[PDB]
Design a protein around this ligand. Structure first.
Ligand SMILES: Nc1ncnc2c1ncn2[C@@H]1O[C@H](COP(=O)(O)OP(=O)(O)O)[C@@H](O)[C@H]1O
Lengths: 60, 459, 577, 123
């Protein structure tokens, strides 16, 4: 019956791991998606200027 | 931009073209085909009249009508950034994952300039590597040059990897730990088999310390020549992480045997009289310039640790390559072929493994000062033994007298117990302990190399 | 092409002038013999040709031209049971047209252009493919031969002719991109087809030879060397290996060998009968043979052909055998070309290219996964020949680097005739830390200890022998003399084997595991037995050892018949002791 | 998870850099039809000839030939073929044949100012 006890312990260990590893993804992936987006948005504004700058240099 | 045409000789990775005038000895140029695809190019010998280009590819289908060169830069420099970790690169240095070409922060030359001795600060910390062998006797000081001598078909790589996962500072003997330090590594090989490759990778992801690392990979199948480019490329990634980013990077070299192979080729195929046993003489330099980079500077939180590993054939330490390496380098730890097939892992043992940096403030002071002299005992202790490995096989089962019996008795013992470690980790103390326990079977009054207190202290 | 002619001649080499804008390494038809050379050096208007066709009485002024293309194989079916020599040319035809010799300068196609084949298109017009996918199958022997699309060739499909009897000649599938894909295609040998990704080892590769596999097996990818002086098996064990497999096709090189050296090899093959198809084993074999009176340099060409075949078939799902006969040849080859281009050779006289290319030769093989998601693995097992007869030449010694495991052989065993002559205190393996999955899957877990438990024996055999001859077995006791005839059995029924025996011709894990328990017993029983005041003399005389001495005889079917039979006799006869 | 986060970000920045590149490409391709196209001609024409210490003759699109009068006076004149955005030339002998493509100028500056743009960009 002690072999039973440990066997059952394993269950809990695999479960807790499972559920959480799945959860860790949720938070991370949607934060990845969120920040990735947030750098696009960050960029937009002065994007233009770079082209202006670069163009001015290469030209002659 | 520039633009050079006028081939004259192609044959082996040596090229010739005239009308140079402002080309630079050692310059990355290009090789536009006719097919349309570029190839590399080093200026390994400008001249008044012609010069040598150093094809980093092979040549194939190449002609005398569309072979067109273009000086890209005078010298090889490269960008780098912190953010690029976990990515792959190769001898050229293009990324391999498929993600963006890096955005450099600062470009820096690759050949570098060497250190200034005044700027260097003496080593003084060491880490627990998890194998006694080192960790008792030789003491892997931080930022050291350690070559690990091996042969083919021995466990060269594995053992290296172990170190990578057990490498860690000791806060205990200080007041400063990994609560004051993170940890990191940069790995490259220079071509290897495939079998070594993947095997490697699976130990970085399962540690997961991959992220905080850099990989350069040349696989043993690319154009040979880029064997001599690659080391340095990575090596400059060391200072950079060391000095402005500040780090604790272990840098690992393996397949250096093959370094020189290729090296030789340009060496002699172009010309130079061989500078000894089928190799050029500036081999020395070329293997100075690699190894020499390590160490630490005053007041910096970097650490340039070089750990090379390679294999010469047989076990002749006198075979060219490890040869000079020896002088150059510092450390010296050997696998022991003999032990291998008698199942003891890692087979590393002192038979000529002879450290270097040890006395300088580690394994003592901060560490127990019943260590140093321990080691030294054990050293001769082993000596005394193994002498008789022959004398035994000469006299008969035994004719030796009783005392000396103990010698042989602890030998055989020692090797078996002490030197065999499973995927174990033995703390410096858990290690040490054993040591006195092996000193046990020798009665006192033969151990004459450690003070009277210490000897009984831990008997 | 390009025109130009000769400049000076030096044996296999010739230089040529006036050629310009010529490509690097090519099909170079030279002379009116038309010799296919190769541009190694390209210097100015001056081209080094480099034949693979034996020279004789050329002059200066004969036409020299070149395709501007390297060197590649006509691909398709019809490959198995073919001849192709090293320069691809098929001896079949040659044999016929040229009487009884080999005569340079005779040119023919490689793969036949007259043979008919049923065609099953597995494609329809307007469809879209990718480079390396299959377009259709063709019935070849017990094989799903397929037409794999060439590299960087893809797109829409214009048409697909339906079924029919054809020569490889016609395009059955012309692309809707205006691309007439004929069956065979051109893939230059000095390069390798890539693969989608590479699959990795964990699956044993058996040639089934007992000791060979059991002590130091290799995996199905992997790489290994064979070296030793002339005499121990090298030259002919490989032949034998062919006669069994854990693989499909069998692709056999041979270089610098003499005709008699491969005679039987050819003619016997139809009598060989593979059991994994039941076929007559010549149907999956390839003759790439080379004489020994060809140019030195044609022993280069020759090698490269094999491996480049291997991938093609391998991408067709298959397990490929490459068994490289003697790298020494190849060596010498380059060693000769050297003279020509006048380069300061590295020590022991070789070009320092040396293991450059060698290195790659080993890499290319292995288990992989294709674009087609097919499997197949290339196994390679290379042989070497240093003059002294051991590691003592770089050309062998450095060969030991870029490789997996190796299969040592030595003279001494060859004298007392133990085929093979593996020094079992020689070689290593480098997969036995990863072949255990399949082990305890087919044998069962009690293999992963017990095998090792044989090793200990011979480990300890060594350590005593030394003293045995230093004094005598006499001043040693029972337990000492124990292992002496343990070891004995480990030779009697392993090391000593034949490849002539109708019985030991093929052997297997059952017989393995089989004797692996047999011996175990004697040990375990005797260990207690001689401590029963018993003398080992007597234990030597116990006929049941003598019974196991017939171990190499039970034809492997009724093998557990005799297993279990004598099993009892052990626990029987010894219950006296 | 962290690795996905890193990739994502770097990937995204790639979207940025590529656009900035695209705009340059678009811009550079719009320079002929900006009235400053004759103006631009000799900048680069003089520039290449200056870089070639030899001299022989220049070669270009007949389009831009007119804009150049300077080295229609000087040089040997052999203003031919097309270098088309860029100007080409060859100095004495076959030799080196140094040119100046505008698009090669992007690639030159790119290799430099890969770094600078990122500073300007993310901020
Ligand atoms: N596996 C074996 N080991 C040793 N000798 C063998 C073995 N099998 C056969 N022989 C005998 O030795 C001969 C030559 O062995 P090998 O080394 O292959 O050839 P050679 O030295 O004649 O080129 C075989 O043809 C046969 O007569």
């Amino acid at each position: 019956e002690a072999e039973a006890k440990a066997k059952a312990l394993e269950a809990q260990y695999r479960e807790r791991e499972r559920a959480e590893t799945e959860a860790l993804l949720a938070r991370y992936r949607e934060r990845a998606e969120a920040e990735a987006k947030a750098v696009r948005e960050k960029a937009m504004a002065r994007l233009d200027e770079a082209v202006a700058l670069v163009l001015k240099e290469v030209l002659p | 931009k520039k633009e050079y045409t006028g081939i004259t000789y192609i044959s082996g990775p040596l090229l010739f073209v005239e009308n140079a005038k402002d080309l630079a000895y050692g310059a990355i140029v290009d090789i536009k085909d006719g097919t349309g695809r570029v190839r590399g190019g080093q200026v390994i010998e400008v001249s008044e009249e012609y010069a040598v280009i150093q094809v980093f590819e092979e040549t194939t289908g190449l002609d005398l009508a569309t072979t067109s060169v273009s000086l890209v830069e005078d010298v090889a420099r490269l960008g780098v950034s912190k953010e690029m970790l976990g990515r792959r690169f190769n001898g050229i240095g293009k990324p391999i994952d498929g993600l963006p070409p890096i955005t450099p922060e600062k470009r820096l030359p690759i050949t570098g300039l060497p250190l200034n001795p005044v700027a260097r600060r003496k080593p003084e910390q060491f880490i627990q590597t998890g194998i006694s062998t080192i960790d008792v006797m030789n003491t892997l000081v931080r930022g050291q040059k350690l070559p690990i001598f091996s042969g083919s078909g021995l466990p060269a790589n594995e053992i290296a990897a172990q170190i990578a996962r057990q490498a860690t500072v000791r806060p205990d003997l200080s007041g400063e730990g990994e609560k004051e330090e993170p940890f990191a590594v940069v790995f490259a090989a220079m071509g290897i088999t495939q079998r070594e490759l993947s095997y490697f990778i699976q130990e970085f992801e399962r540690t997961g310390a991959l992220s905080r690392s850099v990989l350069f990979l040349n696989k043993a199948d690319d154009p040979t020549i880029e064997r001599i480019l690659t080391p340095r490329m990575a090596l400059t990634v060391a200072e950079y992480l060391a000095f402005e980013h500040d780090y604790h990077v272990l840098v690992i070299l393996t397949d250096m045997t093959n370094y020189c192979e290729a090296l030789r080729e340009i060496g002699a195929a172009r010309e130079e009289i061989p500078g000894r046993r089928g190799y050029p003489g500036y081999m020395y330099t070329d293997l100075a310039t690699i190894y020499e980079r390590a160490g630490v500077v005053e007041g910096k939180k970097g650490s340039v640790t070089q750990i090379p590993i390679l294999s010469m054939p047989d076990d002749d330490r006198t075979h060219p390559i490890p040869d000079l390496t020896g002088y150059i380098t510092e450390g010296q730890i050997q696998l022991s072929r003999e032990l291998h097939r008698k199942g003891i892992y890692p087979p590393i043992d002192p038979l000529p493994s002879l450290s270097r940096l040890m006395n300088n403030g580690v394994g003592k002071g901060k560490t127990r000062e019943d260590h140093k002299q321990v080691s030294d005992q054990l050293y001769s202790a082993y000596a005394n033994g193994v002498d008789i490995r022959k004398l035994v096989a000469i006299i008969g089962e035994d004719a030796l007298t009783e005392n000396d019996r103990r010698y042989l008795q602890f030998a055989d013992a020692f090797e078996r117990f002490f030197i065999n470690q499973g995927q174990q980790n033995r703390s410096i103390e858990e290690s040490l302990q054993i040591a006195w326990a092996l000193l046990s079977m020798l009665p006192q009054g033969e151990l004459k190399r450690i003070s009277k207190d210490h000897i009984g202290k831990y008997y | 092409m390009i025109q130009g002619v000769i400049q000076k001649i030096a044996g296999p080499a010739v230089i040529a002038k006036g050629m310009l804008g010529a490509r690097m390494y090519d099909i170079c038809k030279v002379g009116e013999e038309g010799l296919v050379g190769e541009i190694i050096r390209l210097d100015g208007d001056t081209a080094f040709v480099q034949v693979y066709e034996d020279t004789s009485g050329l002059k200066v002024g004969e036409p020299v031209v070149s395709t501007g293309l390297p060197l590649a194989v006509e691909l398709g079916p019809g490959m198995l049971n073919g001849i192709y020599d090293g320069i691809q040319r098929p001896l079949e035809r040659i044999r016929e047209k040229t009487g009884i010799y080999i005569t340079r300068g005779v040119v023919v196609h490689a793969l036949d252009r007259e043979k008919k084949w049923a065609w099953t298109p597995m494609v329809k017009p307007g469809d879209e493919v990718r480079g390396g996918m299959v377009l259709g199958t063709v019935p070849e022997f017990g094989f799903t031969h397929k037409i794999l699309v060439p590299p960087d060739v893809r797109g829409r499909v214009k048409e697909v002719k339906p079924a029919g009897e054809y020569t490889v000649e016609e395009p059955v599938v012309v692309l809707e991109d205006g691309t007439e894909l004929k069956m065979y295609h051109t893939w230059p040998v000095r390069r390798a087809r890539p693969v989608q990704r590479k699959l990795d080892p964990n699956t044993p590769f058996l040639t089934g030879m007992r000791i060979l596999d059991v002590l130091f097996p290799v995996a199905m990818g992997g790489t290994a060397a064979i070296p030793g002086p002339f005499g121990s098996g090298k030259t002919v064990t490989q032949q034998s290996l062919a006669k069994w497999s854990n693989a499909d096709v069998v692709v056999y090189v041979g270089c610098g060998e003499r005709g008699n050296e491969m005679t039987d090899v050819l003619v016997e093959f139809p009598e060989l009968t593979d059991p994994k198809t039941g076929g007559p084993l010549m149907h999956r074999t390839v003759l790439i043979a080379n004489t020994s009176n060809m140019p030195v340099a044609a022993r280069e060409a020759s090698i490269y052909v094999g491996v480049t075949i291997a991938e093609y078939f391998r991408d067709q799902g298959f397990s490929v055998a490459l068994m490289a006969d003697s790298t020494s040849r190849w060596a010498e080859a380059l060693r000769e070309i050297s003279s020509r281009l006048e380069e300061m050779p590295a020590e022991e006289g070789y070009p320092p290219y040396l293991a450059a290319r060698l290195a790659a030769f080993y890499e290319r093989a292995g288990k992989v996964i294709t674009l087609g998601g097919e499997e197949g693995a290339v196994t390679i097992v290379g042989a070497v020949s240093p003059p002294g007869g051991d590691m003592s030449e770089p050309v062998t010694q450095s060969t030991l680097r870029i490789v997996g495991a190796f299969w040592r052989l030595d003279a001494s065993l060859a004298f007392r005739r133990h085929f093979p002559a593996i020094n079992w205190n020689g070689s290593y393996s480098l997969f036995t830390s990863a072949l255990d999955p399949w082990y305890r899957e087919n044998v069962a877990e009690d293999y992963p200890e017990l095998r090792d438990a044989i090793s200990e024996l011979l480990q300890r055999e060594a350590g005593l022998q030394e003293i045995v001859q230093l004094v005598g077995p006499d001043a040693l006791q029972d337990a000492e003399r124990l292992v002496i005839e343990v070891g004995r059995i480990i030779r009697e029924d392993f090391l000593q084997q034949n490849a002539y025996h109708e019985v030991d011709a093929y052997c297997s894990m059952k017989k393995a595991y089989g004797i692996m328990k047999m011996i175990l017993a004697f040990y375990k029983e005797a260990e207690a037995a001689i401590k029963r005041g018993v003398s080992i003399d007597e234990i030597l005389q116990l006929p049941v050892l003598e019974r196991i001495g017939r171990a190499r005889y039970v034809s492997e079917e009724e093998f557990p018949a005799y297993f279990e039979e004598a099993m009892k006799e052990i626990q029987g006869a010894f219950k006296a002791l | 998870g962290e690795l996905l986060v890193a990739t994502a970000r770097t990937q995204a920045r790639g979207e940025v850099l590529e656009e900035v590149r695209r705009r340059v490409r678009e811009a550079l391709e719009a320079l002929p039809q900006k009235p400053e196209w004759p103006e631009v001609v000799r900048k680069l024409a003089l520039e290449a000839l200056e870089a070639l210490p030899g001299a022989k003759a220049l070669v270009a699109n007949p389009e831009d030939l007119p804009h150049l009068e300077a080295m229609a006076r000087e040089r040997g004149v052999e203003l031919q073929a097309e270098p088309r955005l860029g100007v080409r030339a060859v100095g004495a002998e076959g030799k080196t044949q140094v040119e100046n493509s505008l698009l090669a100028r992007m690639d030159r500056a790119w290799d430099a100012m890969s770094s600078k743009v990122a500073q300007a960009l993310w901020g």
